[PDB]
Amino acid sequence: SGFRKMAFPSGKVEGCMVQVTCGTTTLNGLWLDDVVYCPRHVICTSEDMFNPNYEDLLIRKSNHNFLVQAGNVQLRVIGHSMQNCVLKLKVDTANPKTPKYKFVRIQPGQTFSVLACYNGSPSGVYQCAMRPNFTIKGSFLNGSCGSVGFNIDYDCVSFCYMHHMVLPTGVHAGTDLEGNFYGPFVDRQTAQAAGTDTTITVNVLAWLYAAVINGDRWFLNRFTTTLNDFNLVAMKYNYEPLTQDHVDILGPLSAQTGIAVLDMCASLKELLQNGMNGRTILGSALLEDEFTPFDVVRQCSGVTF
Amino acid sequence: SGFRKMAFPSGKVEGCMVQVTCGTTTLNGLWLDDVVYCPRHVICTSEDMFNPNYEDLLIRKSNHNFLVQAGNVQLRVIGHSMQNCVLKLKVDTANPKTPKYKFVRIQPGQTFSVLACYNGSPSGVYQCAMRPNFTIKGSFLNGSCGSVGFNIDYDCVSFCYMHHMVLPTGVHAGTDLEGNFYGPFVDRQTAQAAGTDTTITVNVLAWLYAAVINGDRWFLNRFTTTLNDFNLVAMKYNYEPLTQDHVDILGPLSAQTGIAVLDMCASLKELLQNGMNGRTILGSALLEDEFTPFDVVRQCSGVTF
Ligand SMILES: Cn1cc(-c2cc(-c3cc(Cl)c(F)c(OCc4ccccc4Cl)c3)c(=O)n(-c3cccnc3)c2)c(=O)[nH]c1=O
């Protein structure tokens, strides 16, 4: 009963967060095995950020110019390298709290938990979605760079995001753990447009299934639609087109509730054309698109880790 | 930049979660030092729940009838006692991961993080508020009993909630860690009304300050009000009365933004009387009341733990 925006338990990631200092700049790093990962702009000063030559800047740094602390445990840096937009510092000690982990590049529309950190110390945890335009709508202040996003699969942490910057529009951009930005963005203080964003249709549908399961049912109607007819409405309202692959991903929820996917599409079509008429769904007066079908099933089934 | 419903990092609580089994019943317990805390209905069968005599039921249990596992570490039970609605099992081993902690009874309108658990294994973490009627709007499935709510203050975990039950209305009820229920509720399967609930006015005001800080400003107007005039509107819309103590708690946010508390009350009054006109505030089409003034300052200042 109930439906909340729920994050993964963050303990396994907390034990990997460290503080990385290079000269005047300090930010967050991720210590896994004997490597620390952090944004490469740790090597920049404020003046460098407008058109940094990162290869040139890194050449002026030696191992001993990087200080890494895990709590008050000082780590010794014995190597450094740059991979795309991330810096990898080899340290002389393997993190004893390293969880089972992998690095994943997530798809737009997928969700993950963010552990927001400052000066290497965890501050809070929240859930969010990779937007279709490869931004995230996070909560980040100065000093949060290097905070990571992740999913947890039983005992395995899949790291998918490292925070690098806030755009002038107030939305957030970052990389995977190989240092490749999501979206068109560069780690430079220069004008950068984010794409037109859209609403994640398959997630909205999943959330409507979650609502029915919890007893919010007023939006169910006697109409149906076709995939093609629904997608005409999706395009008008700036929703992502629904594909058969999306229909298939909703199969388990359709099976549990007995509501065909295209009938739920007919409900969503009426909500888009008519609004909510002052009503709410799972405590929201908007259509929510940051729960995936997997999220809904996990929360409506009680999967643990 | 951004504003999210943010939970505390849960690692310190994860290391305290255990599985408690008594006969057929298994649920979650909290292992601190050499004591495990859990709901006393762990000693009940389904048939006992309608009018249980907990003193009589506990008399039929011995130390060896309680099994406690922390992962695969089996704990030996060497004593048991009942305190109000909680059971305390003394074990032969102090939890080596016990954080600095205290037990707190929170006030209505205060927020806390919940670590939802199943069979002793953490599942997810979310933030929520103690409602004015002493329920919480959580996300709990069968098996979540014994999950705990908490706040973290640097290195100290203040445990304030243990989950006991879902009411027929789908809202959730529980105790403090001394086993005293919040609200009028009893741990019996019998009809139980929750009070009329109300909206947490001082929290809505805090969230409006958070919105201004983040650049959502359209609801600011040229009007003002008095405490008494505003409270006439509060009563009409089922908002808690605003007191001078509430005004004082909002002092820091007033000081940061330069918006007098009573001017923000004038904004809130207009929102209550006129609605949002199809607009949103911090991504919401409703007035949000589960952020306290402390929450807003923490998230808009970057406090870590
Ligand atoms: C040295 N240093 C730097 C940072 C840090 C750096 C950045 C940051 C990083 C890079 Cl590469 C940028 F190109 C950048 O230009 C922003 C911009 C301006 C104009 C047009 C386009 C763009 Cl993109 C900004 C940042 O945005 N933030 C931040 C702040 C608030 C919320 N989220 C992120 C923080 C830090 O945290 N710690 C630390 O020590």
Ligand SMILES: Cn1cc(-c2cc(-c3cc(Cl)c(F)c(OCc4ccccc4Cl)c3)c(=O)n(-c3cccnc3)c2)c(=O)[nH]c1=O
């Ligand atoms: C043995 N056992 C029991 C539980 C367990 C017990 C309960 C539960 C506990 C007590 Cl004391 C009750 F009086 C109770 O009557 C509900 C009720 C019915 C009619 C009128 C008023 C009321 Cl109050 C229910 C529960 O509500 N839930 C639950 C389920 C879904 C979400 N949240 C909570 C779970 C468990 O999790 N594990 C485990 O082993």
